[PDB]
Design a protein around this nucleic acid. Structure first.
Ligand SMILES: [Mg+2]
Ligand SMILES: [Mg+2]
Ligand SMILES: [Mg+2]
Ligand SMILES: [Mg+2]
Ligand SMILES: [Mg+2]
Ligand SMILES: [Mg+2]
Ligand SMILES: [Mg+2]
Ligand SMILES: [Mg+2]
Ligand SMILES: [Mg+2]
Ligand SMILES: [Mg+2]
Ligand SMILES: [Mg+2]
Ligand SMILES: [Mg+2]
Ligand SMILES: [Mg+2]
Ligand SMILES: [Mg+2]
Ligand SMILES: [Mg+2]
Ligand SMILES: [Mg+2]
Ligand SMILES: [Mg+2]
Ligand SMILES: [Mg+2]
Ligand SMILES: [Mg+2]
Ligand SMILES: [Mg+2]
Ligand SMILES: [Mg+2]
Ligand SMILES: [Mg+2]
Ligand SMILES: [Mg+2]
Ligand SMILES: [Mg+2]
Ligand SMILES: [Mg+2]
Lengths: 31, 100, 121, 78, 93
RNA sequence: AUUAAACCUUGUACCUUUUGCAUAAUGAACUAACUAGAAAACUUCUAACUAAAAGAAUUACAGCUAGAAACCCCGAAACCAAAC
RNA sequence: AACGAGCUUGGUGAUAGCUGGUUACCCAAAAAAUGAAUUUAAGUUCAAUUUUAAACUUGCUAAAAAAACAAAAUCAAAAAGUAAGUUUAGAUUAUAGCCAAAAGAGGGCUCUUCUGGAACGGAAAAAACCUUUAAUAGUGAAUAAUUAACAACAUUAACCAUUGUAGGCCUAAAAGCAGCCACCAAUAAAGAAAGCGUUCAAGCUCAACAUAAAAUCAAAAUUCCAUAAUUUA
RNA sequence: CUCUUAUCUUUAAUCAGUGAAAUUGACCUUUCAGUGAAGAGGCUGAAAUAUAAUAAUAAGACGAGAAGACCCUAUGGAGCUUA
RNA sequence: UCGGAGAAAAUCCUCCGAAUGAUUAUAACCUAGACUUACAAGUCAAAGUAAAAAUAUCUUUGACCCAGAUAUUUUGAUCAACGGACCAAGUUACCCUAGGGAUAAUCCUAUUUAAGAGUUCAUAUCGACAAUUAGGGCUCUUGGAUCAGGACAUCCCAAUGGUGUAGAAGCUAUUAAUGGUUCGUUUGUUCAACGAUUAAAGUCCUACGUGAUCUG
């Protein structure tokens, strides 16, 4: 059981999640 | 009850005002400050209160302090907290009373 | 216990990229702030309620002019989340006694001293 | 719960505004010492106005005209 | 609708703010005589003049306070370099 | 609101009591009449005369005299005296 | 007709810290429901709060160092943003709160401490969460909060097997395999064997021989319950 | 009682005459799931639905009248017994 | 009632003590300014004057009224329910009025793990240590009759997989709510038992389902 988070706190977590950068070309399809 | 510092450092104090209450000697009388039988501290002059550290030397007659003091190492000596009041007025001035 | 908090000093030390983005030279700093309230003081601690009344920001969306001096800035930091700050700008110079009755403030932050309500042509 | 798209964007827009607020508060025109005393004269005058209003209370004048005008209630065409 | 675009062009977000549509008079007599000023416009004019006068007052105090400080700086500076009397030496002074 | 009475849209009866909350719980079939805040020690306001005021007895180191200004209704189980 | 003590009149408008009720309009201000005593806790008095009037002068936010503390509450210079504060006179009511969010203490309750709230909009209905400076007329306008969100992958699959000897050991025997120490041998390539399985043995595999190829966590009890929908800047 | 049945009288129903009582905030007085103070005819979301009588059943309207009982309080009472 | 220690400024929180005693070379009168405190009570003290040749240290009780004592100054409370009525106990089911309420552990089921049971062989049948955002159940309202609505976690009837399944009997698991699910009786048994039967005599929810339908 996880104690529920105040909706304001829940909004904070959603906006600060990790975002990875993505390459333009996938390595496998490259020579 | 309510043991504590009645007058804090940097306050104008009149004669007779009580500065601190204590069950034991957390502070010691200094300049122009007296002792009450209950060990309260009051001001003997009109002026500003000050708290300062200073060296402690006991009366020769009392045994307990002398025994401890001599037993201290050569390097340093013990200290204590002292309370002082700085007088702020001239006790009097000369004025012309009569021309004879 | 929820209590008053102190912001770390680093927050208010800018970076070179910030100067480019917002277009302010770290020299020749501006003199007058334009401040507007864009949120509400209900459900906020009482210290924030009092400061908003000290700065004159009772009505929302009405601009107030203040000095860019340290004592004022100390108060603005307390209510930074409820207000918007824009630097004042005077393209045509400070208003004189002659032009005092023809000034008008634009949304950009420019206090023009002549207002004719005519096409620029 | 799942945070809706609207809620995430609206919060971001408010974050961006506050970021600019931090920047414009970092460049004080005058240092603390230069500020000291620069507005003393204006402040002192203001309190003098406040004190003057406080100590100005007193009753109001009374006039014979007000009392004697009550008689016009019985004016007529003779 | 269109608030953000209006601000980009430098106008007010609400078309009911400053501009010709709101500020200009709404009517005039058929002869050509001008109409009396609208009550809302008179209030708007007074508010702007009040704001402008504050701008003048605040700037002058800040400028007057910068010079007064540096003038004090000098007085301390010259006062520091001072001397008097004389400086003998040896077995009699 | 409407061209149009009803159709469409909006809207959790009233008083009292409870924790500023009621789909809680008291009270009300409806009409007419009847049915519940009262006193002047001190204070404030308005005048007369003033080291004095008051139509006898009282108060007074600006006082004293007069006016105006106030504090509810209904309801027990009981106790005692004398008759029947 | 109603006796744990008859009935009637009077004392009597008995008394009730308890229950119920207490009749026109408008404007203005405003509570907390903490501390102390009480045959007191269903009540009252005092402080504290609030408030009307009057006199006259500094208040609120902030607050350096330097203390006192132990290794954020006092204290309040000078400034700045700002309009309150003290003294005098009079007066009641109130003295049980509720939910959310923090920190503790006795172990879900129960206390103590700091902050916030009481929509006519929003979260499905919605006292306590979120947006919201008062209140007026208009068939104008710009905005705020706003239950929805877009099940796998990312060292092997092909062919095989000869021997010193069944290695010692009360174990009949315990042979690669019960142990128990050693653990070496030939051969291109073969562990005194990684498993099965045999009373022990046999027998089946693994690894070896050549021959090939691929390439970590995650998106229950009346009767289902808006309707629907994957791409137009 | 297994396991109930038949007949007659009283009641009941229709016609004629006379004519009460408790009760009653206003009612244009529906079902299911959800919400809620074990609780919804009236609130949220769905669904159903021409208008009125006569005779029957008793699930609900926390159905009506209960002088019906258990627990607590009051510096309210009364009867009895004493040391 | 008062004081000391912890919690730490809460408590019916954890502990100890007090209603004094010993020694005193005997500690006067008068008076600025302060602490503490709702009130009442309680603390400290400069200067001046006076005796002497300045403070006694140990360290904690009780108002007013009203009665005392003597030669003017003093003394009287386990009023301990400790802000203290000058002096009063039981009992009521024979009872009355005014009101306010009301009326984690355990344990079993299901998943994960797998030492040991099973002659041999972990998982036919079980199963330690554990794991389970797992389910659901010193004391002090229920039965029955009538009529039933519904869930599936299935007792019987039905379709299937495995077996330490030869046949016949059985043990275990999956799917499914179709209709049904008896009649009598108490000597002993802390919410039990007995006789005769049946294909079976299932487990539960519905304010004891149900008392304006009835009854113990
Ligand atoms: Mg009741
Ligand atoms: Mg009624
Ligand atoms: Mg009437
Ligand atoms: Mg009465
Ligand atoms: Mg409080
Ligand atoms: Mg008493
Ligand atoms: Mg009481
Ligand atoms: Mg200051
Ligand atoms: Mg008839
Ligand atoms: Mg209808
Ligand atoms: Mg329902
Ligand atoms: Mg409905
Ligand atoms: Mg019914
Ligand atoms: Mg009937
Ligand atoms: Mg009833
Ligand atoms: Mg009492
Ligand atoms: Mg009595
Ligand atoms: Mg009595
Ligand atoms: Mg002395
Ligand atoms: Mg007592
Ligand atoms: Mg007492
Ligand atoms: Mg009996
Ligand atoms: Mg059934
Ligand atoms: Mg099943
Ligand atoms: Mg019933």
């Amino acid at each position: 059981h996880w104690r529920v988070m105040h909706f304001q706190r829940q909004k904070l977590m959603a906006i600060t999640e990790y975002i990875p950068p993505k390459p333009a070309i996938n390595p496998r399809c490259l020579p | 009850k309510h043991y504590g510092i009645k007058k804090m450092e940097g306050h104008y104090v009149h004669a007779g005002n009580i500065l601190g209450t204590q069950r034991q000697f957390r502070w010691h009388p200094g300049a122009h400050v007296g002792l009450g039988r209950n060990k309260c501290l009051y001001a003997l002059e009109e002026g500003i209160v000050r708290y300062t550290k200073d060296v402690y030397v006991p009366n020769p007659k009392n045994t307990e302090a002398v025994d401890l003091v001599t037993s201290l190492p050569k390097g340093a000596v013990l200290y204590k907290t002292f309370v002082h009041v700085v007088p702020a007025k001239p006790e009097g001035t000369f004025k012309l009373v009569d021309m004879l | 216990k929820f209590t008053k908090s102190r912001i770390p000093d680093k927050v208010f030390q800018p970076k070179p990229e910030d100067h480019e983005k917002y277009g302010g030279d770290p020299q020749n700093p501006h003199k007058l702030h334009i401040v507007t309230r864009i949120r509400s003081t209900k459900r906020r601690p009482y210290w924030e309620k009092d400061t908003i009344k000290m700065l004159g920001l009772q009505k929302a969306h009405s601009p107030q002019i203040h000095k860019n001096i340290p004592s004022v800035n100390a108060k603005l930091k307390v209510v930074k989340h409820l207000i918007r700050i824009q630097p004042l700008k005077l393209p045509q110079g400070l208003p004189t006694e002659e032009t005092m009755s023809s000034t008008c403030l634009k949304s950009t932050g420019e206090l023009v001293v002549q207002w004719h309500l005519k096409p620029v042509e | 719960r799942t945070v809706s798209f609207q809620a995430k964007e609206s919060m971001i827009r408010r974050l961006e505004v506050e970021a600019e607020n931090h920047y414009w508060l970092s460049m004080p025109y005058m240092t603390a010492e230069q500020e000291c005393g620069h507005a003393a004269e204006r402040r002192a005058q203001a309190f003098e106005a406040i004190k003057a209003a406080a100590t100005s209370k007193f009753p109001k004048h009374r006039y014979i005209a007000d009392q004697l005008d009550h008689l016009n209630i019985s004016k007529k065409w003779s | 609708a269109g608030g953000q675009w209006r601000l980009q062009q430098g106008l007010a977000a609400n078309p009911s703010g400053y501009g010709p549509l709101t500020e200009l008079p709404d009517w005039s007599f058929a002869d050509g005589r001008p109409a009396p000023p609208m009550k809302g416009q008179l209030r708007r004019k007074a508010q702007r003049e009040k704001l402008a006068r504050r701008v003048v007052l605040l700037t002058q105090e800040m400028d007057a306070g910068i010079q007064a400080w540096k003038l004090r700086q000098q007085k301390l500076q010259e006062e520091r370099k001072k001397e008097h009397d004389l400086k003998p030496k040896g077995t009699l002074l």
